Every structure is written in structure tokens, then in C-alpha cells.
């Protein structure tokens with residue numbers, strides 16, 4: 001969604017510490033895989049964008065949801081979220097567990 | 113811009129540690145209170161979205177840029193960037209200097 005779309009009620013920013021660019025590419029490919037297609041159809045899901053840090057040491061997911069309740073009761077309650085968490089957090093090359101920060105959009109500066 | 117617009121070549125995620133929700137509100141209010149009106153017309157600036165962490169301890173900015181070159185040359189190299197930093201650090205309730213992570217969008221999941 002546009003970053004300041006009013007439908008975006010909740011945002012998760014998840015950071016995965018990796019040992020380098022080869023692992024960053026694998027992590028992204030696995031996360032945006034094809035078998036993660038079910039996420040697209042979860043009620044309340046708006047977007048998940050994976051980024052590689054410029055220094056090769058981290059992959060960051062910025063994800064937009066309609067609400068915290070949608071994220072917790074529709075994605076979190078689904079058995080596939082536990083499956084995906086296991087898979088991503090056990091890929092070889094990870095230097096620690098993913099760290100998530102949950103947050104609400106409160107203001108935005110955009111060009112006119 | 114849409115999170116997966118291909119024009120987004122460079123992203124900065126800046127985390128401001130704060131002492132609770134009241135400071136969260138005051139910092140977003142400051143950041144969107146006109147101190148950075150000038151940024152809207154900077155070439156290559158796409159957006160700056162400020163969010164309050166749900167735990168009350170940080171304000172996070174997700175900022176989209178057309179390229180790292182536009183960010184460094186049209187933002188970082190402009191003396192007004194430093195004035196903006198100084199304005200945001202002068203607020204009571206900040207608990208440390210802001211932390212930045214620089215990154216490139218590499219994959220996305222959108223709805224359907």
C-alpha cells in the first residue's frame with residue numbers, strides 16, 4: 001500500500017541478522033518464495049517488503065497490516081506462520097534470531 | 113510511494129529511542145510540524161513515515177528515496193539535514209541518539 005494509506009493500521013519491522021550478501025539473497029528468495037503465496041490472501045494483510053541492508057549484514061521486512069488484531073488473529077493464529085518462522089529462523093547463515101518491532105503509523109511527509 | 117514501487121532505490125530506517133508514549137506523540141508532532149517542509153521538494157525524496165512503537169519506547173521513520181545518490185547529495189550533503197537532526201534531538205524525552213539502518217528493497221509480497 002502507499003505508505004500513508006489510511007488502511008495501514010499496524011506495521012511490523014522484522015530484522016534478520018545474517019553473515020553476508022549470499023545469505024541475504026537466500027533469505028529474501030526463501031521469504032518471497034512462491035510457497036509464501038498464502039500470505040497474500042490472509043484477511044487484513046496489506047504488504048511485506050524485504051530489504052537487504054547496504055552492508056550485507058541484515059535483511060529487514062517492513063510489513064503493512066490493517067490492524068494488530070488482523071496480524072495476531074489471522075496470521076499469528078495460522079499454523080503456517082509457525083512453519084514460516086521455523087524455516088526462516090533456521091536458514092544457515094543467520095547470526096541470531098530475528099528481532100521484530102511492532103508499531104503504528106502516526107504521520108508522514110510526502111512530496112506534493 | 114507504494115512499498116514495491118520500483119522507483120524506490122534506497123531506504124533509511126531511523127529509530128529514535130524515547131521515554132514513553134507522551135514523548136512519542138511530541139516527537140512525531142515536531143517532525144511533522146513544519147520543520148521539514150523543505151524536504152518535500154528535494155529531488156529523489158519519496159516519503160518519510162513516522163510510527164510509534166506499540167511498546168512506547170521508540171519512534172521509527174521509514175523513508176523512501178529514489179537512490180542512495182539522491183539521499184547523500186540532496187539530503188545528507190545539504191546543511192539543512194543537520195539543522196533538522198538538531199531540532200529533533202532538542203526535545204525533552206529523547207533517550208539517546210537516533211539509530212539508522214540503510215537498505216535496498218529486494219523482494220515483496222502484495223495482496224491478492
Ligand SMILES: CN(C)[C@@H]1C(=O)C(C(N)=O)=C(O)C2=C(O)c3c(cc4cccc(O)c4c3O)C[C@H]21
Nearest residue numbers: 012014039048063084085086088089098099100
Ligand atoms: C523467523 N521468522 C521469519 C520470524 C520470526 O522468527 C519472528 C520472531 N521469532 O520474533 C518474527 O517476529 C517474524 C515476523 O514478525 C514476521 C515474519 C514474516 C512475516 C511475513 C509477512 C508479514 C509479516 O508481518 C511477517 C512477520 O511479521 C517473520 C518472523
